[PDB]
RNA sequence: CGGCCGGGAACUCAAAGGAGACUGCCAGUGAUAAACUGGAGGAAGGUGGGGAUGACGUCAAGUCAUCAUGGCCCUUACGAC
């Protein structure tokens, strides 16, 4: 039962969503003072800065393993990099 | 009325040996950086101040009168009193 890779790659396409701009759930892989790591899993676990998660007294109230929601502005940038954006998500909320 | 004189190893000082200052700590900037700026502490803060220390070479630079030395010249003389 050689399941065909184009099948399984289409149930792949109709479960995630793919467009520049789109609101998608990420996981939070890593924490640094520099950056975040977070995965939609498109292509790279990309990296925000670190003040796109801070409130007004500058807090990371984000944590390791939560479910957060950044803007996908281009699934890959030349450099390898799925490229996120969590203050396009908060533009929207 | 003078450390002067008993006296004391407290203090200056005399040298000898050590401690200390390294962006070490904090904040910002910075390119997930090197570094920079500011602040605290500290006698001292970013090489703390100063000195000694002069790479390969250039100027046929200077010195045959410090010295040494290749050559050339004088030897009753350019030597010596
Ligand atoms: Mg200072
Ligand atoms: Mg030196
Ligand atoms: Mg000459
Ligand atoms: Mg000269
Ligand atoms: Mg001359």
């Given at each position: 039962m050689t399941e065909s890779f184009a099948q399984?790659?289409?149930?792949?396409?109709?479960?995630i969503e793919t467009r520049p701009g789109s609101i998608v759930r990420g996981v939070v892989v890593?924490?640094?003072?520099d950056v975040v790591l977070?995965?939609?899993?498109?292509?790279?676990?990309?990296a925000?800065?670190?003040?796109?998660?801070?409130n007004a007294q500058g807090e990371l109230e984000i944590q390791v393993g939560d479910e957060v929601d950044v803007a996908l502005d281009?699934?890959?940038?030349?450099?390898?990099?799925?490229?996120l954006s969590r203050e396009k998500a908060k533009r929207h909320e």
């Amino acid at each position: 039962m050689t399941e065909s890779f184009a099948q399984l790659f289409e149930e792949s396409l109709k479960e995630i969503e793919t467009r520049p701009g789109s609101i998608v759930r990420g996981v939070v892989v890593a924490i640094d003072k520099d950056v975040v790591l977070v995965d939609a899993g498109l292509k790279s676990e990309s990296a925000i800065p670190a003040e796109q998660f801070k409130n007004a007294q500058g807090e990371l109230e984000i944590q390791v393993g939560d479910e957060v929601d950044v803007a996908l502005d281009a699934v890959e940038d030349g450099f390898g990099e799925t490229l996120l954006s969590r203050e396009k998500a908060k533009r929207h909320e």
